């Protein structure tokens, strides 16, 4: 049979082919990105997994380690569900707690209402 395989942050169960496209279930704290193709992979009668289409990604606040999604260490953030690691808190910010999506700005600092969360804070 085809082995139970964890690949692309998604679990693919052990499966037997048929004389065989199977979908993958996203792993804990990983999700399918909004406009993206869901994890699918093909099983072959010789016991081989073939042509992986699509992937899951670690959601905000989590990053990819081995083949799991793990919380951002305190001091780091990840605001989108991207292929990136956790990013260190930017200039003029305060150390974030675990699983952070952004870092709080420092007393006396702000980021304009337009600016994203991956941006340094500026003097008010």
């Amino acid at each position, epitope marked *: 049979k085809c082995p139970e395989l964890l690949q692309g942050l998604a679990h693919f169960p052990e499966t037997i082919a048929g004389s065989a496209t199977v979908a993958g279930t996203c792993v804990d704290h990983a999700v399918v990105p909004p406009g993206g193709e869901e994890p699918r992979m093909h099983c072959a009668v010789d016991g081989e997994w073939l042509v992986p289409i699509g992937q899951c990604l670690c959601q905000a606040g989590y990053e990819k380690v081995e083949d799991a999604c793990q919380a951002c*260490s*305190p001091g780091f953030f990840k605001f989108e569900a991207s292929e990136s690691p956790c990013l*260190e808190c930017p200039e003029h910010t*305060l*150390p974030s707690p675990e699983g952070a999506t952004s870092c709080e700005c*420092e007393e006396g600092f702000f980021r304009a209402p337009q600016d994203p969360a991956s941006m340094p804070c500026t003097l008010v």
Partner: antibody
Amino acid sequence: EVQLVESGGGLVQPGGSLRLSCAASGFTIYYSSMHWVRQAPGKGLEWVASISSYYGYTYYADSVKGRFTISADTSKNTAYLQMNSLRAEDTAVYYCARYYAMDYWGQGTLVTVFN
Amino acid sequence: DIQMTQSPSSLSASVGDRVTITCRASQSVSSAVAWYQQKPGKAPKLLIYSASSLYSGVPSRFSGSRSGTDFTLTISSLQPEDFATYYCQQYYGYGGYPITFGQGTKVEIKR
């Protein structure tokens, strides 16, 4: 395994110049801040310079500002510290470390300024 | 330049004891404080980050605490491998202010 291997330290005369390298394996220099921390013989750690390819900033301690230049080449995952107008107090072991809370350090390289 | 005053500069202790090194910052520095151990001839090792969080792999006997500006590192039962020198470092603002270190505490064996 994240690794930092430094090189370039050694003997140099005042006013001469020297360049230290920091080759990194196991992670991407672009996605990380890198810092240089020096230790004079018998003293504690002193910060020297910092670099973030991502946010694009190069920061120096007040005591070395304008004589050293920090740089990095994300292709070769290597950060450089160029030391110019070298003085007696610049004699120290120079370390490169990753992140502000520095979780991985290089082994160090010894810079000796001799008259 | 936020000064980091480390106390004490030296202490002698027996194996198993509770060691407590203190570091008072000149300003509010949030939790942007870290602790390192250096054995002679070797590079420092991160011990505690965000003033209270254990790095991965550091033995559980190490801990860090905050109250306002006074950060304290504590060793619950000193083991023989913990005879070394310790540094507090603050990194407040993640680069917006100079990274400054404590001056160090050397922990020696009582005899």
